[PDB]
Each structure stands twice: as C-alpha cells, then as structure tokens.
C-alpha cells in the first residue's frame, strides 16, 4: 500500500474520485510549514500536521522505523512553484528524522507534467521542459496546454497518473547533514 | 425633491442589482458577464483553458459594476459537474467538492466554455441588448431547455428569495419537447448529481434521503446522506453532539462516489428492536430524511417579477417565448436566403457567360465590360461583386460546380423557406445530445 | 575518461548564458530573449501594451534554459531612464526613479517596443542562424549605433566583469558617423541621465561628482548625489554615519530633476574657510568624489572575448562588422531587383497585350492561353501569377500606370544598383535625428 | 500614525494642524470607494468639526 501526502482538498477530491480503496491512500496538508531543522523534536511533536503524519503512518518521533500502517509514503505536488521548493525541503527534513525510511527508500515523488498537447484522441505527456525541448522536432498538432498546478489536469489524467505513476525517488547523498543546511 | 435621486439610485440598487434570475436564459446578472468574458476569449481557441484571473480581471469592460472577487469566486462555484447536473462551463482546476465545497486557490485554476453549451445555447448572438448602455452582455441569452429547471438557482434579494431546484436532463428535454406540442405539461423529475439515495415527495414538497444500511447488530454503513450535507459540518453539527453523549462513533471510509460513513453504536444507547422505532431513532438521530420548501419567484422578460407555484407554467412561458424567438430566426433566414438565391443565380449565369465568353472581354479598357453589365436587369445591383473575376474560372468544371451549388442552394432555400418553429426547435431538442 | 563530459557540460553553463554582452548588439542573451518576446507580443501592433507576466511566462520556448523570474526582473530593471540613457523598451507604469531604484511590480507594469529601437535596429533578421537550435534570436542583432556604448552594463561573470558606463548620444552619433569616414575616431563623451554635476578624468579613470550648493552661512541644498546609492543605503552609508555623530543634520525635500535634500549645519564640526579645506572636508565627508573603474571586456563575433583599452577599437570592430553585414543586404537586394524588373516587364507587357487583346480568351478551355504563355521566354516563369488576373487589370489606367510604376521600380532599381554601403549607412546615421 | 501626522490628537479640537487640507484618492473601481472611504469617514466623523 501507499500513502499520498498530496496538497489540498482538490487533490484528495480527485484522489477520492480516482484511487483504489484497498491499495492507494492519501492525506492533504493544512498549509504553510516553516523551516524544518530550526525546531526541537518535542516541537515537531508540537506541530499539528507532523503529528498527524506521525499517527497515520504510525511512526511517531523517537522510535525505530517499524509498525508502519503504510509501507510507502508518496508526496504529490504541483509542478510550477507550489510544491517544487516549498513542501519538499520541509517534508524531506521531517522524513530525515528516520534514516531507515530513506535506506529502504520509502518516500517517493509522482511527477505531474509541465506541457501537454492534445493530439488525436490520446493527449501526450511531456513530463518536463527538457523532454519538451528534445521531442519538439517530431510532435504534430502543437496545441499547448500548461500543467502549472495539480488542478490543470482533469480526472482522467489524474486516473492514469495514479494508476500508472513513475514514482521518482527522493534525494540521498553520502552525507545527510551537508545538503540540508544550504537553505538556512 | 432630490432625495429621491438617492432613493431611485436605491432603485438602481434594488432592481438591476437584484439576485433574481430570469425565466428565459436561467441566468443571474453576473453569470451573463462571466459567460460573455469566457466567450470573448473563446474565439478560435474555444478549447484553451483561459486563466481565472484573465476572466476575473477581464469583466471590468463587460459592464459589471462590482468587485472582481465576486466573479473570481463565482466562476469557481459554477464550473462544478458535481454541484450541478448539466455541464454548462467546463474547466481545469478545483470547483468545489462534496468533501469540501471550496476551491484550492483561484490562481492555478482555468476555465472553459463547453461544446455542450453550444449544443444547447443556439441563438445566443441574436439576443437583444439590455436597456442600460454599459451592459455588453445582452438582456437574456437563449437556451433550448431552460437553466431555471436545470442545476437550480438559490439566492435572497430584498423581499424575494429564489430556491429553484435542479432537475434531470431527459425529463427537462421531454418537458420542453412535450409542452411544445401543447399537451398536458410534464413536470420534470429531479435527479441530484451523484445521488444514489432516494428523492421522493412528502406533502407537495420533496424530501431527500440518502442510504443507511444495517450491517450488524451494532454497526451502520451510511452509504449516502442527503444532498446538503458534507463531511465535517455534518460531523460537528449532528455526529459530534451524538458523540459527546457517548452514543455512537464514526470511521472515515468515504467511497468512490457519494459517501461511505460507517457508524458504530455504543451500549449507552436505545438499540431498540422491531424495525420501526430503531429506524425512527435513525432518521431522527442520524438525520437520514431532509425536507424543504418551494417558492418559484423569478423576474420575467422585463424588469418586473412574477411568482409561480409550479414549473409547468415556467416551461410553458419559456416555450411560448421560444416560439416567437425561433420565428424571428425563421424570417431572418428567409430574407437572407432569397437575396442569396438571386445572387448565386447571377454568379452562375455570369460564369456561364465567362466560360462562353460571349461578352466582349478584351479591349474593354476603362471598365467597358462592367459598363455593359450595369444595364443588365439583375447584374447591376451587384456589379461590384460581378467584377471580382480571375481567369482561373474560364475552364467549365468550376462553372458546372457553381451550377451544382446553385441547384443545391435552391433546395436549401426551399428547406429553410418552407420550415417553421416547431421542426427546427425539435431538431435542436433532438441534437442537444 | 568520462568525467570531462560533465566538465564540458559545465562549459555549456559558461559560454551561451554569460552576463557579458556581445560587442555588435550590446545584448545579453537574456535581453535577446526578452526582446524576442517583446516583439512576439508586439507582432503586428507594436503599440499594444504587453503584460509583464505574459512577457515573462512565454520566454521558456524562446531559448532560455532558466526560469521566468530572471527575464521578469531584467525587463523591469532596464525599462527605466532613471538608470540608463537609451530606452530599449517603453512601458505603461513606473519602473523606478533616481530617488528609488525599485520598480512597481513584476506583475502589474505594461510593456511595449519603442520606435527608436526600429530607428536603430534595422537588419536584425539577415543575421545567420545560431549553432544551438533554441536561439531563434540572432547571435548579434545588428545596430547602426551599438548598445555596448549605449547605456551601461554592470555585470559579473566567470572571471570577467563589465561596468561599461553610458555615453551621450550626439557624441556616439558623431563617433560612428566619423569612424565611417575613416579618420581619427572621436571619443564619445559620457553623460549620465539627468546629471548636472561633474564627471571628469583624473588619470585614465573617470571620477564622478554631483553638485553641492551653498546657500547661507550654515546651510546647503544638495543638488546631486553620486550614482552608487539612491536614498536609504545613501543615508545608512553616509547621512546617518555623519548624522549620528551630531555633526550635521538633513531634511528630505527631493525635487523633480536630481535630488533636493536640505542640509543644516550644527555647531561641532570643522566649519572651515578659505574654500580649499572646507570643500575637501565636504568631498571627504559627503562623498561627492566617487571613483570607478573601466575595462571594455566584451565578446566579439566569435567565441573569443576581446579586451579593449578604449572604445575607439570597439566602434571600429562594430563598423567592420556592420559594413559587410549591410553589403549582404546590398547583394540580396540587387539579386531581388533584377528578377523584380524581369517580372515587372512580364506584367506590364502582358497587360498591354491584354488591353490590346490580340490574344483571344473567349471559348478557350483548359487554360489554353497558358499554352501560349509557356512558349514565351519571359511569361513562362510567371504563369500562375500571370493567370492570376482579375478584371481590374483590363482597364488601361491600371495597365499604363502600372507600367509607369514598372518605370518607377526601374529608377529605384538603378537607385539600389548605383548606391553603395557607405552612403546608405550615412543615411542610417543621418536619419536617426 | 495619521493622527500624529495631522496634529489632531485624539480627544481634542482641530488645533496645531500640520496640514490644513486632507485629500483622499484611490483606485476608483472598488479599491477605495466602498472599502477605505467609509472606514476613513468613520475615523473623521468622530470629529464633526472636520465635517
């Protein structure tokens, strides 16, 4: 099973209209979270949404990475600016409290696209701007649509992007203290 | 006597700024502005999801003398296929939900005109403009089946309050198609969108009930609640006052369509038997039955206001305005097609005289050809269109093709000549789907 | 032996997206892409006001391997004449001031392309295409007066920095107009915008100063402050360091042109006399004398960066680019105008043949006159264009006067044939004012 | 801030007035007509001698 740590009531509305009840889960986030490592572990316990995802996954702070109600944790954001640098450093900093989640690689990313053209009956799926550059030499009927946001896809694209995701991994270099001190 | 200059100003704040809709288009005053802004952007790319800021900041020159925040959230609230039955205006974004009836933002959300709107709102461009000069939308748009019956409208003005209820698409189609024939008017049936409970009358008034299912001795699956209950206001208004007595408890197991609320009883409750007082305690405690009231008050084709007790006379008045406003289109198409018939006949006759070349054509310098064609009895009236002639049509194949077009125009002119209101309106009523 | 494939990829970061402009156009690559988006939002109507986000959000398929914010605030910073002299882009709104060098919004201000750009950027389309496919802007736009000397570039790159200061437009006009003539090149004078102070040479380096104006025994009115600080960094770096010692105080009375700050003397200070040591204490304390550095480090038409001690060689390399880059247009227009007069003789002779009408056209099928147009030596290269002939040709007014515009393009044909590059570039230099 | 700038202290008459006239302009669609004009009028109606 998996848990989607997606954003807002919109994406969980589409997720309720899309997901499998047995396999795929979900949870939104209430709002803006601050810098992750400026706050004590009892103050991550004072924070509300972090305690919510400590209780839903069953991995509360101060314990070994076991008895997890969700074997997978996925986070599903908007690919313009809404979660590309806002949800992810704070969420990866909070998930850095258990390095055994990262050793098993239990946090993934589902890439919503950037550009979609509607060609024929089946629209195309440029995931990034680099694939949009590299495959503009052979792509017909260039009617452009921007996917700057989770709302910019309908229920059908949300359906084939949950039921057929890509599950991009999270970052893990040889040191897990040198790269998270960049933002401060 | 100038304080009435304040008060009549109040009468342009309590007449033309009213929330009362119209019987004909089924539209609010702000809905014509957001529709006109969306179609002003539709043009060729009627499929490019235009930004809700561009709609919302675009209604300034349409004549809406209020805030852009009102249309900015109005377009969010009326682009929902789950709040309303008939899809009028589509889009990509959040437009509300039965979990939470809000949008996620208004700045990552883009809206679109629907092709079903143009399947259902012909004679939009024929619509007469409002008495006020600044109103760039017309006075009322023109549907095939009305938007008063479909999807519902609710509001409260000064002294009058509309609560018009959504109805099912096939029954509104059958109602307009059957009251067009002048028979006993079928009142349309009501189908709330994504509602698997039961909608029935009690006494002149509708009730809505969802679905509750006994699953054990002390367990419940409310598969559906009635329509005006979301998750958390129903939890905090009813289910949490039931929780604080220690009576029941809830599980969050909401389904694919509708709800999935599983409720487990506790032992400090009634838990009565015999299947008439336990169900009484259920729809008095869980609230499985919800009642309402009806008052069909709606502004007519002018600025006055009229009240109906039923939608039968509403459908009758809609189709009796629709009869004349299709008849106007019939007369306009007849007067277009007769002059277009005489013109196409003139051009086919002149392409016969071109591919013959029986007109002297060379050496007619200083336009002596059209000084010869200014005295022909019909060629004169459109000399400026008989002269746009290349050499490319001298071969006879295009002459015979324009003669075939002329014969095709004749039967066409006979088809739109002999026709009337009823068959074209019922062909539109057939081809809305 | 693969790690260099990252490092040359690092060279991919440090060749095409540097902050150093090229020496012909004077354009940064980000400025090339925002110019291309400004004309892309101009297209037909140049005068139409483009939206800053619509400028900035559309650069992504224009060649920029970065985000929209760098072009977004680049367009904000070079839109204003309080910082620069030559307006590359006009706009509706404010983009800064000399008092406050901050723009209004990244999402409110309008933009359009100025007419003087077209008065100085002709022949920006005959440049050869780039190696990279994304660079639909040319590698250098071709001016009559370059932007390296027009306006200023204050940029830091990988080991290279530019602080190329603005110059006065009549002096660069004389400099390019006289370096066209091939004598000793006049050095352009430096005139910062809205400046009535003194920029003077001391030894190889231009120092700047404003004007400070004594008005009484214990008061001044500061006319100008130097161009390193606008208001609050100026106060935090200068006026509050001398104000917090108790020496002197100031008051904000900033006028229209320049600054207007009124300075009141307190009692503990030097208060010196003789107008040598008091002025030296002012330029030591108020910071009127400011020193800069100059180095013309600019990439040429190839990938090598050229370092110039003085802009005379910059103007010489600019004009040695421009002479051949307009002799390309000379050869292109010569090859255009020879076949243009050949088609002119085709149309004039064929229309005198048509108004003669010795060729018979009536009853002639299958474009049979093309069977007598194909065996002409001269009409046969233009057959489709010469059967594209409407009736208005047949009037002899537009036969004979169209023949006399064939003679008018004959005299223009000999006008482009007799002219050479230096006198049309003299027309370019003389008709900018 | 504006009562310190104008010199009309709260609870006293309009005396030691730093500015003789007070003028308001805003974006006159809805930004200042029905939003900040009634709030500023509710501020300035507490001194009816200003009216």
Curated annotation (Swiss-Prot), chains B, C:
For this protein, the record's PROSITE patterns field holds: TOPO_IIA
Which GO-annotated molecular functions does the record name? ATP binding; DNA binding; DNA topoisomerase type II (double strand cut, ATP-hydrolyzing) activity
Q: Identify one Gene Ontology CC term for this UniProt entry.
A: protein-containing complex
Q: What domain of life? A: Viruses
Q: Name one GO biological process term.
A: sister chromatid segregation
Q: Which InterPro entries match?
A: DNA_Topoisomerase_II (IPR050634), Topo_IIA-like_dom_sf (IPR013760), Topo_IIA_A/C_ab (IPR013758), Topo_IIA_A_a_sf (IPR013757), Topo_IIA_dom_A (IPR002205), TopoII_euk (IPR001154)
The protein's required cofactors: Mg(2+)
Topo IIA-type catalytic domain location is 20-429
Cystine residue pairs: none
- Catalytic residues, per the record, are 108 (o-(5'-phospho-dna)-tyrosine intermediate)
SUPFAM superfamilies to which the protein is assigned, alphabetical: Type II DNA topoisomerase (SSF56719)
In Pfam terms, one family for this protein is DNA_topoisoIV
What species is given as this protein's source? Answer: Enterobacteria phage T4
The residue ranges crossing the membrane are none
Which EC number(s) are documented for this chain? 5.6.2.2
Q: What keyword terms does UniProt attach to this protein?
A: ATP-binding, DNA-binding, Isomerase, Nucleotide-binding, Topoisomerase
Its catalytic activity?
A: ATP-dependent breakage, passage and rejoining of double-stranded DNA
Protein name per Swiss-Prot or TrEMBL: DNA topoisomerase medium subunit
Q: Signal peptide position in this chain?
A: none
Q: What does this protein do?
A: Medium subunit of the DNA topoisomerase that untwists superhelical DNA. Controls topological states of double-stranded DNA by transient breakage and subsequent rejoining of DNA strands.
Q: How does it assemble?
A: Part of the DNA topoisomerase complex made of gp39, gp52 and gp60.
Membership in a protein family: Belongs to the type II topoisomerase family.
């Amino acid at each position: 099973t998996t848990l989607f740590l997606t954003e807002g009531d919109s994406a969980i509305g589409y997720l309720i209209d899309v997901r499998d009840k047995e396999l795929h889960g979900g949870y939104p986030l209430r709002g803006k979270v601050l810098n992750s490592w400026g706050m004590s572990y009892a103050d991550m316990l004072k924070n509300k949404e972090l305690f919510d995802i400590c209780a839903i996954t069953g991995l509360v702070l101060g314990e070994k990475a076991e008895n997890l109600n969700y074997h997978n944790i996925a986070i599903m954001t908007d690919a313009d600016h809404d979660g590309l640098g806002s949800i992810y450093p704070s969420l990866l900093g909070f998930f850095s409290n258990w390095p055994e989640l990262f050793e098993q690689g239990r946090i993934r990313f589902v890439k919503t696209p950037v550009i979609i053209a509607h060609v024929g009956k089946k629209q195309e799926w440029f995931y990034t701007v680099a694939e949009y550059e590299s495959a503009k030499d052979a792509l017909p009927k260039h009617s452009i649509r921007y996917i700057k946001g989770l709302g910019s896809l309908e229920k059908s694209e949300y359906r084939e992007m949950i039921q057929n995701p890509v599950y991009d991994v999270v970052k893990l270099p040889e040191n897990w203290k040198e790269l998270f001190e960049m933002l401060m | 006597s100038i304080i009435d200059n304040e008060a009549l100003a109040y009468a342009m704040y309590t007449v033309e700024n009213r929330a009362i809709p119209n019987m004909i288009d089924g539209f609010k005053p702000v809905q014509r502005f957001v529709i006109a802004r969306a179609l002003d952007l539709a043009r060729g790319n009627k499929d490019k999801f235009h930004k809700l800021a561009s709609i919302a900041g675009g209604v300034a020159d349409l004549g809406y003398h209020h805030g852009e925040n009102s249309a900015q959230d109005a377009g969010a609230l009326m682009a929902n296929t789950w709040n309303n039955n008939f899809p009028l205006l589509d889009g990509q974004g959040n437009f509300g939900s039965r979990t939470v009836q809000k949008a996620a933002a208004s700045r990552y959300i883009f809206a679109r005109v629907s092709k079903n709107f143009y399947n259902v709102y012909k004679d939009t461009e024929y619509a007469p403009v409002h008495q006020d000069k600044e109103h760039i939308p017309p006075a009322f748009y023109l549907p095939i089946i009305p938007t008063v019956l479909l999807n519902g409208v609710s509001g409260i003005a000064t002294g009058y309050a509309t609560y018009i209820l959504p109805h099912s698409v096939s029954s509104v189609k059958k109602a307009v198609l059957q009251a067009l024939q002048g028979k006993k008017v079928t009142k349309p049936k009501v189908e709330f969108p994504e509602f698997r409970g039961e909608v029935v009358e009690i006494d002149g008034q509708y009730e809505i009930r969802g679905t509750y299912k006994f699953t054990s001795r002390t367990q419940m699956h409310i598969t559906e609640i009635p329509y005006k209950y979301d998750r958390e206001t129903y939890v905090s208004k009813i289910l949490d006052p039931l929780e604080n007595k220690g009576f029941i408890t809830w599980d969050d197991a909401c389904g694919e369509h509708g709800f999935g609320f599983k409720v487990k009883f506790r032992k400090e409750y009634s838990l009565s038997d015999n299947e008439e007082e336990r169900h009484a305690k259920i729809m008095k405690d869980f609230g499985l039955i919800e009642r309402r009231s009806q008052n069909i008050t709606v502004i007519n084709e002018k600025g006055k206001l009229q009240v109906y007790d039923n939608v039968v006379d509403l459908i009758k008045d809609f189709v009796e305005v629709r009869k004349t406003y299709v008849q106007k289109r019939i007369d306009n198409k007849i007067k277009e097609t007769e002059s277009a018939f005489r013109l196409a006949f003139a051009k086919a006759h002149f392409i016969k005289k071109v591919i013959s070349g029986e007109i002297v054509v060379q050496g007619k310098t200083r336009k002596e050809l059209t000084e010869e064609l200014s005295k022909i009895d019909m060629y004169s009236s459109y000399v400026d269109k008989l002269v746009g002639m290349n050499i490319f049509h001298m071969t006879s194949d295009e002459a015979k093709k324009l003669a075939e077009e002329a014969k095709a125009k004749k039967e066409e002119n006979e088809y739109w000549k002999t026709t009337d209101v009823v068959t074209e309106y019922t062909k539109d009523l057939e081809e809305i789907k």
